[PDB]
């Protein structure tokens, strides 16, 4: 069985310019997209150094995906789009679809970078014990292993009961891991949607020809663009902040075990050496020379990695279009896997373990866990029938939660009451920016003095 | 007349996908583009509000321009683009070109909104007297009537002899007002480039078939998209911040003298009234109902204004391609001019004159003028020869200026010394963000205590 591009590019919407272009416009004009500007990506955003935030990273991923779609729809059309209905305009739909899924991919991630997800998962693991009878079911893993992709899908499908009313193609491409926490798929080790979205994704799977464990072909492209953006622009930011030099990056790539014989890595290194041989002649500050060489390396590396990803996607298009697809990621099957791995290693060694990043992660973990404690004081028991929340502090912290999250929490559905409370807490925490989370944590800590003692 | 072959010149100024797409890619990854996220657009940046910044406004304008380009290249190609070489791929160039010029249109604008430009102009008028023999030429008007478009062109052309190396089509499109301060024309009341770029612009005009007073056709589209974004999105921000309600906007449009018996305004009003009546049934908080109604109004108004702009551009394409074009703006020749004027009046009455915006403007003016005084203390005389600047405070404030601006200032050219010093100050002030400008102002004020008295 092979999936068809007519179903994968379904322009219909769940609620009973091209449609996909309108989807991209709605995603861009959405409030969470603008809120992404205040969410930390890797490095602290308080510093005035033009460091990457979630919004800038999302826009870069969207641009890379749009360029890949441009190449796919204009150059390699007959190679990958073999059987497409005439009413579908690939040149207008594919770039727009890739740009939209790139822009929206990190919309539901919690603040404070990766430490946000890690802290939420740790708090949920501690406060929703797996041995306890209330939180024994695997569905609560949705919070014990909380992931931003499921929250993003929930945000785009249930927050407004259809949300932004994205097309089926967009929603299908949003699902990064086609399985839930209840599922036991060996191919994917992470859940891609919550239990509350279990019906919705099913509807998507009923309109795009997809099923559990089967990924949309454009999801691979979006993930590859995300990985490329991470690996390249994190290194660029590392050099920009002065945590390392361009020569340090070149030496790290050259001395990497898998990049000594890698053709792409050697080509990039040679081109960067040639350019740096000319950039040093002009009178430039060491920071200025580092920035120039870093920009040139970014251009070369992004071009090479994007070309390798496009080639890999074109070569493995038949495997992607088949339901029995075992490809993990597009980078791993491409010729640029070694360079991307080396860049990720460099980013981990030089940027992710720097003093500033570690301090930011520690502060984010502290803030998130404290705020989750104070909010759980007012959330727990609301749906299970208990009354322990009915305190002035509990009422206040419940009133501080955004009204849409509370409205979804006070609804009739098959979700267990404990699951509803945990989902309310997760929705409240995930949608917060760094500054808003810190301010709310400080205010609640100030107001909690009597009840805490 | 003018041919599209020259207007869409993909050649780059520096002597030696698509080139024009590469222009948008380079603009997106530029550091000042990321710095735009820290510059206020109209309203101050809060910790919770999703008000537009310069970056979000630029992205919205770019999206609108890209949609216009898709409509022009995919539907109205025969009506708009006649006698175009088969080498030029309109479907890939026109949308990319419009998006690139929309994203870059506000790169060089000073911080603190429009008050930034106003404060820079007032300070330059006071400290560069027109009666003083040192400053009598019209060239110093470049600073007495400082404009963000000229600084944007300067940044893209002379900041990295070439900067981003944008194509000739892009550079021609970013010239909003095709005239200089020295040249006096009744067509345009503002200068579009500095004296230092006179040779660059003359080059661009040579490679695009344009001339003084003749504006690139896509500049009209970019300006129309900028105006539409300004009006509609500022109204949306006003509603979101709570300064006015959706019913207030509806009443203002209905009670507007020109918007009466206006087809576009009536259509938008009726559609929004029906949608609001439908929405009122759902139990939502007043803020939520206002947000939903304003979002639907934004969708309807943006669609109507964009369609009117497209129709006006298509109808007047022959005049736009003529060197004797007398059109001042695309909106005024469209059917949506009345709605745009009413929206601008509503924004001025409720948003721009709100106490928060007035306080932001006053603080920005104070900060900008104080910092300009303290920087002029260390800049003045560096090029004329007089050595009042050679003080520890002057040396420090000169060292705090960005190295690239200082390097351009120290270059030997035909610019007068006073012009070079004023341009150094303008480049320093314009490139700062709000927070960085405030921090530098506080630092210098702390360090200026002894030398002040
Ligand atoms: Mg990402
Ligand atoms: Mg603008």
Numbering used by the authors:
A (entry chain A): -1 to 14, 29 to 172, 177 to 469
B (entry chain B): 0 to 15, 29 to 172, 177 to 469
Question: What's in the article?
Answer:
pmcDeoxynucleoside triphosphohydrolase (dNTPase) enzymes are effector proteins in animal and bacterial cells that hydrolyze dNTP nucleotides and inhibit viral replication. We therefore named the dNTPase-NTase anti-phage defense system Clover and designated the dNTPase protein as Clover protein A (CloA) and the accessory NTase protein as Clover protein B (CloB). Likewise, CloA exhibits strict dGTP substrate specificity, with the activated enzyme only hydrolyzing dGTP and leaving other dNTPs including dTTP unaffected. Together these results demonstrate that CloA is a dGTPase effector that senses phage infection by specifically responding to elevated dTTP concentrations associated with viral replication. Clover defense encodes an accessory enzyme CloB that synthesizes an additional nucleotide signal p3diT that suppresses CloA activation and protects uninfected cells from aberrant nucleotide depletion. p3diT binds to CloA in an allosteric site adjacent to the dTTP binding pocket and raises the threshold of intracellular dNTP levels required to trigger full Clover immune activation.
To define the mechanism of dNTPase-NTase regulation, we determined a 2.4 Å cryo-EM structure of the Salmonella enterica dNTPase protein. The Salmonella dNTPase comprises an N-terminal HD domain and a C-terminal α-helical bundle and forms an octameric complex consisting of four pairs of dimers that arrange to create an architecture resembling a four-leaf clover. The clover-like CloA octameric assembly is formed through extensive interactions across three distinct interfaces. First, HD domain helices α2–α5 interact between adjacent CloA protomers to create anti-parallel dimeric units with α2A, α4A, and α5A forming primarily hydrophobic interactions with α4B, and the α3A residue R46 forming hydrogen-bonding interactions with the peptide backbone of the α3B–α4B loop. Second, CloAAB dimer units multimerize through interactions between the CloAA C-terminal α-helical bundle helices α18C and α22C and helices α6A and α17A that interlock the CloAAC dimer. Third, the CloAAB dimer unit interacts with CloAD, forming pi-stacking interactions between α12 residue H263 of CloAA and CloAD thereby stabilizing the CloAABCD tetramer. Similar to canonical dGTPases like the basal E. coli housekeeping enzyme Dgt, the CloA HD active site motif H117 and D118 coordinate a catalytic Mg2+ ion along with residues H69 and D242, and the HE catalytic dyad H126 and E129 are positioned for substrate dGTP hydrolysis. Interestingly, in contrast to SpdGTPase, no activity was observed with CloA enzyme alone, suggesting that Clover dGTPase activity requires recognition of a cue that occurs during phage infection.
